Ligand binder design. Structure first.
Ligand SMILES: NC(=O)c1ccc[n+]([C@@H]2O[C@H](COP(=O)([O-])OP(=O)(O)OC[C@H]3O[C@@H](n4cnc5c(N)ncnc54)[C@H](O)[C@@H]3O)[C@@H](O)[C@H]2O)c1
Ligand SMILES: NC(=O)c1ccc[n+]([C@@H]2O[C@H](COP(=O)([O-])OP(=O)(O)OC[C@H]3O[C@@H](n4cnc5c(N)ncnc54)[C@H](O)[C@@H]3O)[C@@H](O)[C@H]2O)c1
Ligand SMILES: NC(=O)c1ccc[n+]([C@@H]2O[C@H](COP(=O)([O-])OP(=O)(O)OC[C@H]3O[C@@H](n4cnc5c(N)ncnc54)[C@H](O)[C@@H]3O)[C@@H](O)[C@H]2O)c1
Ligand SMILES: NC(=O)c1ccc[n+]([C@@H]2O[C@H](COP(=O)([O-])OP(=O)(O)OC[C@H]3O[C@@H](n4cnc5c(N)ncnc54)[C@H](O)[C@@H]3O)[C@@H](O)[C@H]2O)c1
Ligand SMILES: Nc1ncnc2c1ncn2[C@@H]1O[C@H](CO)[C@@H](O)[C@H]1O
Ligand SMILES: Nc1ncnc2c1ncn2[C@@H]1O[C@H](CO)[C@@H](O)[C@H]1O
Ligand SMILES: Nc1ncnc2c1ncn2[C@@H]1O[C@H](CO)[C@@H](O)[C@H]1O
Ligand SMILES: Nc1ncnc2c1ncn2[C@@H]1O[C@H](CO)[C@@H](O)[C@H]1O
Lengths: 432, 432, 432, 432
């Protein structure tokens, strides 16, 4: 039977609403887009299923989509990332949301599947909004009959984008897709500066440990690794980076970090955090070398960066929960502290990124949903990014809140550098 | 009638004990002092009343004093700083503790008064361990008859030390006192690096706001102000400092901060945090100038740095609690967000300093209690500090945990610079 | 008549050679390329005219090209950037170099023109190696008859690349061109980290001023602006950034800088430095507002970022040379200090970037010259970049010198993220 | 016969004067003291011999003393620290100065001895102004007959202060002495922030090496070590600190540096710089372990921190001068680069600290000379410091130049914290 929503505790809605109102003031881009596109109702007729961490920030995105005319259903893309008071507030607003903090895997799948059908009539979704690819996979692999009537999808994160390029190479991408991750105002702000805000936050809330003087190994120096390393360095930690990519490794050395193999530094590390989007970064052989009370955690999208299966099989019998999402294992006499069972730690042990940086990602997300819903016929079954002018517009919408003033080119200065006075200001290859 | 303890929820003890065990590993100085002085039972016969934030870290101090032979009673020195699971664990260990998070002022006084008498026999305390001076004032002002049999007191923080110098000038200091605040390993580590760890932590847990690009006004640039400014700068904030002292102001300018009057910067500040130990820093006239959703908080010892009386009198009728210790007031159309009702915010909205830095303060605290209990007859009714050799010993006890190696002077190098090979290494005027 | 070289003082060669030998040890990429391609003589038959700051670093590039088989002639692309002992050493090695520090504009052109013809026979060049486009313009505009026998050109810097895209749009690019600037290992290392090394260096050598606590306005926050801002911030300055581009402006705010219009901050600035590659950044109206003894300088390619014509016309009569390339003007009673007559200040008042970062740029430059000389027939009269594998190779060649260790993907980890174990590791759109 | 001055080249005076005028604008404290005390001629009758690095900054000090009524003679306290154009300008002003860059030791002593007698009449000095103790030792040890008529001495640096405490313990301090080093506005600004400005400066001018990613070993973490470590960290270097003092070592770990024995890190260091004021820090056994082209230098007062005797005895025969004060030795196949022959490197290879920070030290120096000349009868043959009010006054005189605004206490706020509204604001034990 139809289930209108499912949340941990609907009585948390009042608290969630108070925090949503504060978040709105910190998300000027989303609120400006609400205001500019509200009158036009661009998303009228859309039935968007979203699969994205059910946080206070996501609530503002959800209510922006509704404000633009859409019908929306929602689930979280991680079992530990929902903020229960945010979910309760969205449920109390009449929006079908299926999400709570601490789901098991069967519940996680069940929540996604509820979002595919709208109302008692079970009307199918016609738009996909994804973070990591699990909703995309659910529809494409388990409900392929529905794709004929879905106009397109947007994908929010690096890991889900890679899965979309797997599908292109495999001939299994059956609709247009906009890669929101690689808007400049997403990748270079959310992935990097968002993790700078929220990585140390999660370690502090989980463990309360002193960070100054601790040796922190950051595995990876992509956008998440850059921000995560900066997070700990700004708290006084001594950060060593690992990398496979010689360009990213040289960047870390130029920023004043040592860059070593994990095997070189594992036996003296105080904290190890993975940022790679790969698998098998922290293995049984590494756990066997760690010193007592080493904290191990992951801020990449999936928990398989850390071999939790090995740890639970070999040392799970004497696992002790310190408190929820802070587990202590004993490996041959040395305690190992695992945060959020190896799941993305900033959302699992804290609240993820702050509202202001998520306003950039979610402004891109909203513009992508508009573009697909209105203009999907103009696109092939390939992966696209938003045009640079829209990327620039998203950034510009956040400047007044910060007291940032921009210069204005004269027409002659603009011609001198080969641009127009209203932009775009950079060639499409520019890397910022 | 005698009350053996009073805590919020004794069933939190198991969780508290798990966190105490983790804290012990992060407090090598305290555990080393336990180990060195345990066999000697130096505190046998002592009945120490302590008045100090009832945190996990304080639990390790309490159990160190007991391990050294003392009987101990305890209360918190702030109405919001107790960690209820730490209090429960100490209560379950059989130690008289009277403390919970969120006391009112009548309860705060009642808790202190219970600590003055030991057991059903109501045996009076004979040692004072204080943080801020309220326990000292309670005994000296309200129970003066008890001071004849108290061997001495130690005082942990800058504000309580100043009160002790008031008493010296006033002829009302009636026992020897050791100033633990001004051990180098306390003032220059706890006050500064501890606030670097815990100031931003509290703002994040309370508000989840983005700190990068925010204008943060840090009022004061003493040890707490230096650490607090560093806290926000390391998170990407744009910090402006205020000061009355031209030397401290010049330090802030040399560290790359603007230094302005609060009146110059109040109307564009995103966060204002007071660190002065003074009163009347943030006044009604300042609230009237703040922009919408400015966060105002205090990390000095007492809440009177912010004129909360003015704010509650003039705008309390429409106060909204966002969540506990996060209050929203509307001042002439602009929201003002107050953290922890103006009480010390790192303990009120987070967990205070981390264990490792508190091990330095509490190692000094333990050595001071030993020195007074054993050698109080060798002291006048004046304020003293521990000798530099003990200060150096405290620092040395924390080096191995961090992987710090020290050089050893040859006898000839030691003579060259005028020291002995075992220290002390600096003249008593050295400022570090 | 043929002139074999022209330098300030050939007796500086011994000193130049000693510094070249030290630079070789700091340029592992260039020396590795020498070693790998030396036996193959890939540049046999090439007659490369180079127009690029005649520094110690450029000497190692010149001798690498010769080591690979090329005949080379050389001039500097700026009137103040030659290091006379580097020029003398190259002249003493028998290489035709025409360059000294402090040329006038007629001499600058004369030096370029000598490089176009090789030996007493006046054999024409057949390869162009340019930095800024002035050599390209000299050949294309003044000696167009020579382009038929030139196989291609490489261009090293952002400003010259823009000129190449002007030529493409104008139908005046008559040979293949490789954009070396936008190798990742050039733009994201030289432009950014190189200016971090050398911007403050130049201000210190020129003026010896205290940088801590000074208000520095960095105009622009592209790669040069990012590095320049970091240069001054790391010295304790209080940096404000200006920008036209909302994405770059938001980056600066997220990095903890205020971002304002120059007009907002000009009257209180202590140092103003331009990084834009535009013109007309610092105008007469700005000079009229500056406070006494403000230092004004430019680190973009051309001096027209600052309106030096206005300053010399209106206030040149009382100009005082403090020392060479440090000039003091009096504007309505306030002194203005101009560095290097507004020409790129890191090369004009110091020695430009250090050897290690120039090894990255010049490794790319060498590989580009090889690719064009060997494979120019495979290219159209368009602008190209080197493939990502070569970019990665350049970075990898510099890791051992720094003690950087790289992880190696398993074949299964490589397939998981969609790469091969030997790279390239990132999609072509990746921005680092 | 009497010699009126001795400098390298008097024709450098015009250049020196231009730079002195710029320095005056950067030394508001000295110029304010000139202005306040000029009318009173407090130093009338004084004959001050100064022995202090003959830099542009020292020229402003010299001319301030003359402006206050004193007769002055001067020499430099280091063989490499004189700025010849500063010396020429002072000589051209009619002031007896005996100093040039690159003296030998016999010349160094000869210069000091000329300063002891004034004019053709050979009138003896009656005031000593010293930096390091060599002038003090010259008078006390070689001209003891003169001390009866010298009213007192001031001493500027940590090393000379220690020598004064040696003399107190030895009963050989025969006049009052003011320790200028340990004014707060000297030790905590000059020693620390001055070296932050000038340590990296010297390495860049001498070697032009890339600092990002280099491993720099800073020996010592006193005030000079703190500033020197910050210098290199702000340039992107990876700094490891060495220490004998557990408090200073813990400070470095809390600031995010590794802290190791030199023996642990010597074989992989790129730069080693000594800051201890001790001897025998870098020994033959260390040189034998260094890798090729390691840069070794010293920023403590005396060159014996590095065993230059060992290096010259064992490897001097193949020493190569790269350029003046940059020497290359070959130790068993590895090149070692020595800066300034091991003498204080910021003055030997660059220009020492900038004017603004020296204005703080030299404002203290001027007030100390006034206090001794006027009030020496009120002092014993002991070491004294200036009162805190004068320390605060010195800092306050530099605030307007930086745009620093100070708050003003109300009388009630002042009483609350136990001070007066005009200061002093801190107890005498305060460490800042
Ligand atoms: N938790 C968050 O809030 C958050 C935010 C954004 C993205 N993400 C996720 O974080 C992950 C990383 O994202 P990104 O944008 O930084 O990707 P990225 O491609 O920019 O960076 C990943 C880096 O990992 C490196 N790497 C790969 N395998 C490695 C190995 N074996 N050892 C060391 N380094 C290795 C790569 O060379 C690359 O530089 C993805 O899973 C992404 O979805 C999480
Ligand atoms: N929350 C914590 O964990 C924590 C830690 C240590 C100390 N403390 C408390 O914090 C406070 C500050 O301690 P501290 O050690 O930094 O003291 P401090 O004396 O070193 O610094 C206080 C600073 O405030 C400045 N100041 C005074 N009045 C001012 C005003 N009107 N405007 C601007 N600046 C002003 C003073 O000049 C001084 O530099 C005290 O109340 C102390 O007990 C709290
Ligand atoms: N001196 C050096 O060693 C060195 C090194 C590399 C490049 N360069 C030169 O430096 C210049 C900048 O190079 P880049 O790679 O940073 O280019 P870029 O395109 O990455 O950055 C230039 C920035 O200037 C900004 N800008 C343009 N007009 C502006 C204005 N009126 N006000 C404020 N900002 C404005 C643009 O938005 C852009 O972000 C070029 O001339 C380049 O050739 C010099
Ligand atoms: N070059 C400059 O401009 C400049 C400026 C100020 C002072 N100085 C000189 O620099 C030196 C240091 O001055 P300071 O004020 O920092 O003194 P300081 O006493 O504050 O610091 C010296 C530090 O060296 C440490 N140390 C001693 N022997 C050591 C060893 N064997 N290994 C490691 N660490 C060791 C000590 O523990 C101490 O912390 C003195 O010679 C002083 O005169 C130079
Ligand atoms: N507070 C948050 N709310 C929603 N999504 C978030 C939050 N913090 C991080 N994320 C997102 O989580 C993704 C990782 O799956 C990142 O792409 C990032 O955009
Ligand atoms: N976690 C903590 N436990 C106990 N005391 C703390 C903690 N964090 C800060 N403090 C103390 O609170 C005092 C302020 O009253 C400071 O002197 C500091 O030592
Ligand atoms: N030391 C140096 N030698 C040669 N070129 C340099 C040096 N420092 C900077 N440059 C170059 O100058 C160019 C600006 O015209 C930049 O692209 C950069 O590569
Ligand atoms: N530019 C300078 N002029 C004069 N003295 C200086 C300069 N830079 C550093 N010093 C001084 O050199 C001393 C070391 O002998 C330090 O105490 C410091 O005050």
């Amino acid at each position: 039977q139809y289930v209108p929503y499912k949340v941990k505790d609907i009585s948390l809605a009042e608290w969630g609403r108070k925090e949503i109102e504060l978040a709105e003031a910190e998300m000027p881009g989303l609120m400006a887009i609400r205001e500019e596109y509200g009158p036009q109702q661009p998303l009228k007729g859309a039935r968007i299923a979203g699969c994205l961490h059910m946080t206070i920030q996501t609530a503002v995105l959800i209510e922006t989509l509704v404000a633009l005319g859409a019908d929306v259903t929602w689930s979280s893309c991680n079992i530990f990332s929902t903020q229960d008071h945010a979910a309760a507030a969205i449920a109390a607003a009449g929006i079908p949301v299926y999400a709570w903090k601490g789901m098991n895997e069967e519940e996680f799948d069940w929540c996604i599947e509820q979002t595919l059908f709208f109302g008692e009539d079970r009307q199918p979704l016609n738009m996909i909004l994804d973070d990591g690819g699990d909703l995309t996979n659910m529809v494409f692999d388990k409900y392929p009959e529905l794709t004929k009537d879905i106009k397109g999808l947007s994908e929010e994160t690096t890991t889900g984008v890679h899965r979309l390029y797997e599908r292109m190479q495999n001939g299994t991408l059956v609709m247009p897709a906009i890669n929101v991750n690689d808007s400049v105002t997403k990748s270079k702000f959310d992935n990097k500066y968002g993790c700078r805000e929220s990585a140390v936050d999660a370690i502090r809330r989980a463990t309360d440990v002193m960070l100054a003087g601790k040796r922190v190994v950051v595995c990876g120096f992509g956008d998440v690794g850059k921000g995560t390393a900066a997070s700990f360095r700004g708290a006084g930690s001594i950060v060593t980076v690992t990398e496979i990519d010689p360009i990213c490794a040289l960047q870390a050395a130029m920023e004043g970090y040592e860059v070593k193999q994990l095997d070189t530094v594992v036996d003296n590390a105080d904290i190890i955090i993975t940022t790679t989007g790969n698998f098998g970064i922290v293995r049984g052989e590494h756990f066997e070398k760690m010193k007592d009370k080493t904290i191990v955690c992951n801020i990449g999208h999936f928990d398989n960066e850390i071999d939790m299966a090995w740890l639970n099989k070999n040392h799970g019998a004497t696992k002790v929960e310190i408190k929820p999402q802070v587990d202590k294992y004993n490996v041959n006499g040395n305690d190992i502290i695992i945060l959020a069972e190896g799941r993305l730690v900033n959302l699992g042990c804290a609240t993820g990124h702050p509202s202001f940086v998520m306003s950039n990602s979610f402004s891109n997300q909203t513009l992508a949903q508009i573009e697909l819903w209105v203009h999907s016929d103009k696109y092939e079954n390939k992966v696209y990014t938003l045009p640079k002018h829209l990327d620039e517009k998203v950034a510009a919408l956040h400047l007044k809140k910060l007291g940032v003033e921009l210069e204005t080119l004269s027409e002659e200065q603009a011609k001198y550098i080969g641009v127009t006075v209203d932009g775009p200001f950079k060639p499409d290859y520019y890397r910022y």
